[PDB]
Amino acid sequence: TDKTLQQIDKLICSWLKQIDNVIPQLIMEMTTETKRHRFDLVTNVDKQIQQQFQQFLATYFPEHQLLAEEKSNAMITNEINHLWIMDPIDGTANLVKQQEDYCIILAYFYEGKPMLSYVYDYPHKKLYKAIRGEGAFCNGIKMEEPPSLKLEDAIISFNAQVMNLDTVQDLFDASFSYRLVGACGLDSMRVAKGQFGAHINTNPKPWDIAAQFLFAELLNLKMTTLDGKAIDHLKGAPFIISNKACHETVLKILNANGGYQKYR
């Protein structure tokens, strides 16, 4: 019967907050599998959260389609009216090794435009949300655009194991310091908060970055491919989320000297 964004937001926040009741059990009985190789992990926590959201969607928004990490998405196209992108646990490695520093990522796109976004830092019970027209919130405290941050004054975050070492060194020298949380959504939220200058992921999936688009728009962040272009939310791309004042400097470092790949 046609809902407002706030009615949809109310349903989602409510389903997210009631996953607090479900997760301690999943964790107590955690089981791990591998996908691409031995370190590419998936657990019963990832699988249950995803399938519960599937079931939520069947039951509230049955027209709506789901693009999500732990299933095939062959059926998802260019011309989808109502689309949810989900990472049921972003930072699975941190879930398994630490039970901390992981989140649930959700993002709703209406005829391809980001309308609702969610990053649930469950270990710390901090629900980041973005709502087109209302703004961005952490547990309902409203977020505002961070202070300008030049790279020399700012902490940066990226996976240093996946890049050419010279370019890792150049990023070290040009920033104030380096930090890594190890969940794309959480390291992104440190940028949104203004705690990090920038977060780079040179090969994310759609679900690792899906919520961040609307955060970047509402809080005046740069979120681009490492070529400085728009990212297709339906497909990967190498990406940066950054404060406005250090975006260009970071991209120029990444692309210098033949670029950031190990073989250049």
Distance in Å, CB of 180 to a copy of itself, minimum: 5
Distance of CA 196 to the CA centre of its chain: 15
Q: How far apart are CA 183 and CA 181, in angstroms?
A: 6
160 binds, among Mg ion, a copy of itself, none (CB under 5 to 8 A by kind): a copy of itself
Q: Are 199 and 158 in contact (CB under 8 A)?
A: yes
Residues near Mg ion (CB under 5 A): 69, 87, 89-90, 92
92 binds, among a copy of itself, Mg ion, none (CB under 5 to 8 A by kind): Mg ion
CB atoms within 10 A of CB 2: 4
Angle in degrees, CA 232, 56, 40, rounded to 5: 55
Residues 148-167 that bind a copy of itself (CB under 8 A): 154-155, 160-161, 165
Residues 186-245 that bind a copy of itself (CB under 8 A): 190, 195-196
47 binds, among Mg ion, a copy of itself, none (CB under 5 to 8 A by kind): none
Three-state DSSP class for residue 161? coil
Alpha helices by DSSP H, listed for 43-158, are 44-60, 92-98
Distance of CA 174 to the CA centre of its chain: 25
Residues 100-119 that bind a copy of itself (CB under 8 A): 100-101
Q: How far apart are CA 245 and CA 148, in angstroms?
A: 6
Distance in Å, CB of 194 to a copy of itself, minimum: 8
Q: Which of 30, 31, 172, 261 binds a copy of itself (CB under 8 A)?
A: 172
CB atoms within 10 A of CB 19: 17
Distance in Å, CB of 12 to a copy of itself, minimum: 26
69 binds, among Mg ion, a copy of itself, none (CB under 5 to 8 A by kind): Mg ion
Angle in degrees, CA 263, 203, 26, rounded to 5: 135
**Residue whose structure tokens are 């020399």:** 152
- Contact window for a copy of itself (CB under 8 A) among 44-52, 66-74, 91-99, 223-231: 91-99
Would you tell me which residues interact with a copy of itself (CB under 8 A)? Answer: 39, 93-94, 97-101, 124, 154-155, 160-161, 165, 168-169, 172, 176-182, 190, 195-196
